[PDB]
Symmetry: C3
């Protein structure tokens, strides 16, 4: 059960860092 939780958190941490990059690009008008 906590092993399953840990995989879920690892994937969230990934999705969230990708979201952070996308949102910063949008905020800053990057590129």
């Amino acid at each position: 059960e906590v092993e399953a939780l840990e995989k879920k958190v690892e994937a969230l941490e990934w999705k969230v860092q990708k979201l952070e990059k996308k949102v910063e690009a949008l905020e800053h008008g990057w590129d």
Copy 2:
């Protein structure tokens, strides 16, 4: 303790999915 964590992870999982869809829209129209 663990059950409470499971609730928090589900809540986060849902919010991140909504974020992904909205950000994706934002990148198009």
Copy 3:
């Protein structure tokens, strides 16, 4: 182990909430957008 999950989860909540604010601001064009 479980203590570590709990801190990771807490971090995520702060970041996810920051992301929602930013994304809503972008979507509604708040404060010039």
